[PDB]
Paper text:
For comparison, additional structures of mTREX1–deoxyribonucleotide or mTREX1–ribonucleotide complexes were determined at 1.5–1.8 Å resolution. To understand how substrate binding depends on the base structure, the ribonucleotides in the mTREX1–RNA product (AMP) and mTREX1–ribonucleotide (CMP and UMP) structures as well as the deoxyribonucleotides in the mTREX1–DNA product (dGMP and dCMP) and mTREX1–deoxyribonucleotide (dAMP) structures were superposed. Our analysis reveals that AMP, CMP and UMP all align well, with the scissile phosphate and ribose in identical positions. Overall, our analyses demonstrate that the binding positions, relative positions and residues interacting with TREX1 are highly similar across various deoxyribonucleotides and ribonucleotides. The aromatic ring of nucleotides is shown not to interfere with the ITF signals. The results depicted in Figure 3 and Supplementary Figure S7 indicate that the equilibrium dissociation constant (Kd) of mTREX1 with AMP, dAMP, CMP, dCMP, GMP and dGMP falls between 130 and 210 μM, with no specific difference between deoxyribonucleotides and ribonucleotides.
Three prime repair exonuclease 1 (TREX1) is a crucial enzyme in mammalian cells, consisting of an N-terminal nuclease domain and a C-terminal transmembrane domain. TREX1 acts as a 3′-to-5′ exonuclease in the cytoplasm and the nucleus, and has multiple roles in cells (1–3). TREX1 is a member of the DEDDh exonuclease family and adopts a general two-metal ion mechanism for catalysis similar to other members. Our results show that RNA and DNA/RNA hybrids are substrates of TREX1, although the activity of digestion is lower compared with that of processing ssDNA.
Author numbering:
A (entry chain A): 5 to 164, 174 to 235
B (entry chain B): 3 to 167, 175 to 235
Write the structure that this text describes.
Amino acid sequence: TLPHGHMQTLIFLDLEATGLPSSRPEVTELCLLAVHRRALENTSISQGHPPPVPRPPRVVDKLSLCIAPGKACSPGASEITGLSKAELEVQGRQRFDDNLAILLRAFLQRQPQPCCLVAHNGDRYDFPLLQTELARLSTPSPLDGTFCVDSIAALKALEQRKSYSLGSIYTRLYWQAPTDSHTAEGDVLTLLSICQWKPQALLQWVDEHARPFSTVKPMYGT
Amino acid sequence: SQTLPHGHMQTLIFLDLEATGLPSSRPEVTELCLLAVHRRALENTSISQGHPPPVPRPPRVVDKLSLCIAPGKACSPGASEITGLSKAELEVQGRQRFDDNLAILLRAFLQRQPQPCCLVAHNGDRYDFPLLQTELARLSTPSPLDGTFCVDSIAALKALEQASSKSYSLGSIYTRLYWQAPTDSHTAEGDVLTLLSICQWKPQALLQWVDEHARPFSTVKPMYGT
Ligand SMILES: Nc1ccn([C@@H]2O[C@H](COP(=O)(O)O)[C@@H](O)[C@H]2O)c(=O)n1
Ligand SMILES: [N+]
Ligand SMILES: [N+]
């Protein structure tokens, strides 16, 4: 008895932004990687020690975008993300605007439903912040029929002290350092690899814990 | 007093697609990847030094779209072997056809890029661009690529390698420049990233060639009629 049925699409998501929550941050980068349930189930299962790092499914949809913020990145944010408001502006990046919502809506529409976003620390950071950015637009949110889960909770359950930083998890499971860029897409690819460690168990946990994105409280309001 | 045909391109969009077969089969697209890079990000690439130069690092600021598309006809056995895609598997995974919503998606992606914008595709003039024109011609939307320019990177790399003086396949060029094999060949995103690397070899010369040779995508003749 699942709350919202079997999820047919998992969208691995990462957001980068200008700072930490009390700073009222703005998104500077966004990556979505949509995988069908069956592509995850077709991940080959490894019983060796260490398990090889899974490769991504052949069939994936990917969207990665840089976004000009209205406010400057903190020094810590620019160091960690490698992005700056000034550099995003000189490369002509656009704000989080109605055309971006058109793009997101059309990308989501290509995915079989029910669909669930999966983000590392999404419950405390990525999801509330995405909710805030979408709430500013006059466009109705394209995510109001989408579900979501936090992969920190997923991996805590799948593993049954331990750090739950993305890199710490990857190294604990695969016993090699992560090699992805430190970009939103690199973080999404590292998360996909972690989620392919026990893909059937991950899907089961996601099905049991999916909640409507419409219930995510905005990080901050107008 | 000689002028560029369409001004300085502000965005290069590296593009590749996979499809069900070769042109005489009247193929349909099964995968599409666009990778948009601002002129300034390309010009920022560290100068290639040494023999071989290291494979350039992709710019930090890029926009990427990669999509799988259900075709209405089967892939040839050779197309499915090379690309790793089949109609049956794309359908099992619920992929949608090339439709109006996909054109709306592409348009909104393109609208985030500063203009003038130029598509860059390897063998684009004979394959990718005519095929995309055919697919877009079936739709009820305007073309999302009205206003966008295009060029074929085979001609470009022929020019640039002649200047620093052969197969001009994507892999042959990459291996000549960098002395190792590309990865993820014959996948849309893997081949886009290989093309980006080749075009980062001599970015200023590439941008000058592209500026001089860009043509409107609206002038590309469809591969076949509908
Ligand atoms: N030997 C070959 C080479 C290319 N092709 C077709 O050319 C398309 C594009 O080629 P690339 O993979 O080089 O981009 C393939 O997706 C495939 O449909 C083929 O069907 N047989
Ligand atoms: N990988
Ligand atoms: N599993």
